[PDB]
């Protein structure tokens, strides 16, 4: 099966790419696996595959860390993400995001039901498993639980059957047969949970599939629209109907090649302690436990020699940056365009801890609008910060056509030089805030409201007559024939490869 | 003579360091020399010494580019700056800034007058030179003149004789015997010019010395206090009295080993076209010429085989970043401490285009103050933004003790994660602004006023009970013995030198 359609094949692809380190000696899921993976993510090293996990039994489980993290070389920096999507490993971020957006103006391709698959190779009923006995990792030393769920896909369906959502949300082991995790507004797992709660009659049928098709875990991390079934979006994106098998204990459908599947219910009534967890912004607040949603596990099925993916998340760079930030940015780009805003490109700079999105403006179109910074900033901020796709993002930076928003150095240059603090900004206090940013949930103001800004790094003439500067750089401050002469003579004079 | 005391010896030191490329074939001062130097600065390459400059005659002149720019390796990144100061080439930025601050609580060591020096080896009276005939560089293609003066020291003295100021301010050739340049508030050359203008009786006696002692050009770029003669500050810093020779046509004194000296007058009445110039923030605005100060040159003296230093300034990284930013930051650190603010360290991140200064706070002392963010931000901003040392800086970022302000990645992390936009900031509109930032002089608001902000990236408990988080990073999220095991097994497992 292709790598984008089968996690086991993805792992093979990383090996073949010389992007995998297989560790066949014993590794402790208590901190060791995650510490290795953390160092990988901080150094852009090869992804670790832990084949000999202390506490692995009867096939549950090996661990793959850093599934969506960065490679060291610039030429294939995003190669692991490209391998989720059947793209060449040298694919640009623009190409990756365009792939992820491509299904937005395609008919869905609904999934195909098949009678069995590798995920059915083994099973454990409710007398045969204990979640506390599995090699679930402790990912950070101060975490409030062992976070089994950092890179699986939650599957829940609206009561009426018409929307089946796939998404990543964290969860930790609570006891032998329950997890606790985040189920929070405005997320689709929350929206569906609320529909079941209002109906009031039962707990939400649920499954959690680990080691799903890579193209599916990317859509799981993307804020595609309300009411849109991810499986059909992924089918359109990849041009193929995804193969799904029915759960044994409920009527949800899981990817046929899932590594590990948990079946059960998400409670409409019960909660339990959840957190703290070392999170995407780079912090943990030891002892900050709060009540989270509670899941009951009734059944586990799994592949022979099952592999659990894991995100050892925190400071730069891991899946919470590469996937959360970038995929939100993609959706924001599209949202802006659909609201007739002249946005060509969007990206969440890593340097911002993916709390900013830089929006590249087609300034020719801007000029035709005959508008001003105050007006335009307000329009952009109302569109984005009143939408779910803007949830995680606290600062939008508007930049003109000369800035490559996928290059953080250029975004920082434009922000620092073109946006006058205060005057060129509009604050948004009556929007939903992202509480996990420390300045929000651990800050001076309301955790859930406000704290957002539009920073306009467009220069005044970009609204009127056009750019009226040249950069004071090698590229723009010297004629073409001179530049080329300097480059051609560079090593001959005594001064100092793309792939590497 | 030592490298820090003699520019010719500095050039030798760069050669010996394998930090120099001598170009002995003809190079055009019309853009070519500056284009090479620009590429050096953008790549952190070796400094270029142009020994064969098209238009060089009778010894005037060779060019050294990138005198204070960065080296590629992390271990000696600031080595060129260290070589200005007799420090080891591996000196940290903290060590460099501490050296530059060291004379602030020392008695000055006044200069020593000597009867002659190398700067007298050759001379040209007012019938024998023409500034338009020298190989003065065109540094950027859109510049409004040939900027002779990018790394020389202006020497002017108060009418009463009690303060002799040394500073860098740009200047360009106006005609055969005049320059135009910037003389602007609150700069000391401006302050002294205003004293002469109020007296009204004559033009200001002036000299411009190029290729001065490196330790002197660093103090020339630093905002040491009003009324403090730089020569005595440099004497204290280096522990030696600087050797000076009298000008031939006036009673000012210039460094004995200056490469090139211009003697003349700075007009109290006349101006002429000046600019545009490709500047420190990375831009030029073609055609933006304005009236600048006008200097008359009466005499040139120079060393045999004279070398003119040149800054090809613009986008990162050159002397306008390494010296302007860092040295302002140093002075701000001291100013804060002298106003009883608990600031341990200051640096202008390069990523900010040296428009920010990050201020590291001793949070134990902060806690003892029993204050709040609003109050503290206001106090810090009033001290810094009402002082000349704060002139160039538009954003101050307050960070706690865990952040290394000399590491831009950590400053950006703390800013993005710990300072809530709006709420955790105080805007300053009634302070002097730096007009050369594009959002100021080419922006939406007053060019000379406002646009400043204090951003508080201290977390709430840093004011009260202490830091209440751990980073979600390899360093802080795992115990010592585990970290060490991972590191010790790193290459053995299959994963990937300080000097490089
Ligand atoms: C890639 C990724 C996405 C996480 C995520 C992680 C990763 C690795 C973790 C597990 C390591 C840490 C926490 N995460 C959560 C999360 N969203 C959320 O509601 N709660 C989470 O706990 N997200 C983001 C969420 O997947 C995106 O917001 C999706 O848009 C949600 O899908 P939906 O639009 O269908 O609601
Ligand atoms: C290192 C450096 C410093 C420049 C400078 C440059 C460099 C290379 C240039 C020449 C390449 C571009 C422009 N510069 C000017 C400048 N200050 C100023 O008033 N006008 C200038 O034109 N400065 C900053 C000035 O030297 C510092 O603000 C000093 O504190 C001034 O000394 P003072 O405190 O004695 O007034
Ligand atoms: K999703
Ligand atoms: K602006
Ligand atoms: K000075
Ligand atoms: K704060
Ligand atoms: Mn969804
Ligand atoms: Mn001075």
UniProtKB/Swiss-Prot annotation, chains A, B:
The active site is at residue 279. Its main location: cytoplasm. Mn(2+) binds at residues 165, 188, 230. GO terms for biological process: aromatic amino acid family catabolic process; cinnamic acid catabolic process; ferulate metabolic process; styrene metabolic process. Its EC number is 4.1.1.102. The keyword Cytoplasm applies. InterPro entries: FDC-like, UbiD, UbiD-like_C, UbiD-like_N, UbiD_Rift_dom. Coiled coil: none annotated. Binds 1 prenylated FMN per subunit. Keywords: Cytoplasm, Decarboxylase, Flavoprotein, FMN, Lyase, Manganese, Metal-binding. Changing residue 279 to Q: Abolishes catalytic activity. Prenylated FMN binds at residues 165-170, 187-188, 230, 388. Pfam families: UbiD, UbiD_C, UbiD_N. It is found in: Cytoplasm. GO terms for molecular function: carboxy-lyase activity; identical protein binding; manganese ion binding. GO terms for cellular component: cytoplasm. It catalyses: (E)-4-coumarate + H(+) = 4-vinylphenol + CO2; (E)-cinnamate + H(+) = styrene + CO2; (E)-ferulate + H(+) = 2-methoxy-4-vinylphenol + CO2. Its cofactor is Mn(2+); prenylated FMN. Catalyzes the reversible decarboxylation of aromatic carboxylic acids like ferulic acid, p-coumaric acid or cinnamic acid, producing the corresponding vinyl derivatives 4-vinylphenol, 4-vinylguaiacol, and styrene, respectively, which play the role of aroma metabolites. Homodimer. May form higher order oligomers. Belongs to the UbiD family. UbiD-like/FDC subfamily. This is Ferulic acid decarboxylase 1. It comes from Aspergillus niger (strain ATCC MYA-4892 / CBS 513.88 / FGSC A1513).
């Amino acid at each position: 099966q292709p790598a984008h359609l089968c996690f086991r094949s993805f792992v093979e692809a990383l090996k073949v790419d010389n992007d995998l380190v297989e560790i066949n000696t014993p590794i402790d899921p208590n901190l060791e696996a995650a510490a290795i993976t953390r160092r990988v993510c901080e150094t852009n090293d090869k992804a670790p595959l832990f084949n000999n996990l202390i506490g692995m039994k009867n096939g549950l489980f090996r661990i793959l860390g850093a599934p969506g993290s960065l490679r060291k070389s610039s030429a294939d920096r995003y190669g692991r993400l490209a391998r989720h999507l059947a793209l060449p490993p040298t694919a640009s971020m623009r190409e990756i995001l365009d792939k992820m957006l491509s299904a937005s103006d395609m008919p869905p391709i609904p999934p195909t039901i098949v009678p069995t698959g590798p995920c059915k190779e083994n099973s454990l009923d409710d007398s045969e498993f204990d979640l506390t006995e599995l090699p679930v990792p402790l990912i950070h030393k101060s975490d409030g639980g062992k976070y089994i769920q950092t890179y699986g896909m939650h599957i829940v369906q609206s009561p009426d059957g018409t929307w089946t959502n796939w998404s990543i949300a964290r969860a930790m082991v609570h006891d032998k047969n329950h997890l606790t995790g985040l189920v929070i507004p405005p997320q689709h797992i929350w929206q569906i949970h609320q529909m079941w709660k209002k109906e009031g009659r039962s707990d939400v049928p649920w499954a959690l599939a680990f080691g799903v098709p890579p193209a599916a875990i990317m859509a799981s991390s993307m804020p595609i629209p309300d009411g849109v079934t991810e499986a059909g979006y992924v089918g359109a994106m990849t041009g193929s109907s995804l193969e799904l098998v029915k759960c044994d204990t409920n009527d949800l459908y899981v990817p046929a090649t899932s590594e590990i599947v948990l079946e059960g219910t998400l409670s409409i009534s019960e909660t339990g302690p959840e957190g703290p967890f070392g999170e995407m912004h780079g912090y943990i607040f030891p002892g900050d436990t709060h009540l989270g949603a509670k899941y009951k596990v009734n059944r586990i099925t799994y592949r022979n020699n099952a592999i659990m993916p894991m995100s050892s998340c925190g400071r730069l760079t891991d899946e919470t940056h590469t996937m959360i930030g970038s995929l939100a940015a993609a959706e924001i780009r599209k949202l802006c365009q659909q609201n007739d805003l002249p946005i060509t490109d969007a990206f969440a700079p890593f340097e911002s801890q993916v709390t900013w999105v830089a929006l590249r403006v087609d300034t020719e179109k801007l000029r035709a609008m005959k508008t001003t910074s105050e007006g335009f900033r307000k329009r952009v901020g109302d569109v984005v910060f009143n939408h779910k796709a803007g949830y995680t993002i606290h600062r939008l930076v508007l930049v003109g056509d000369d800035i490559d928003v996928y290059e953080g150095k250029d975004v920082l240059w434009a922000f620092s030089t073109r946006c006058r603090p205060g005057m060129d900004e509009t604050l948004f206090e009556d929007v939903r805030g992202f509480p996990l940013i420390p300045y929000m949930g651990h800050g001076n103001g309301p955790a859930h409201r406000g704290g957002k800004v539009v920073s306009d790094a467009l220069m005044p003439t970009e609204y009127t007559t056009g750019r009226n500067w040249e950069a004071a750089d090698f590229n723009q401050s010297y004629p073409e024939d001179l530049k080329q002469k300097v480059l051609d003579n560079w090593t001959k004079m005594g001064f100092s490869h793309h792939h590497h």
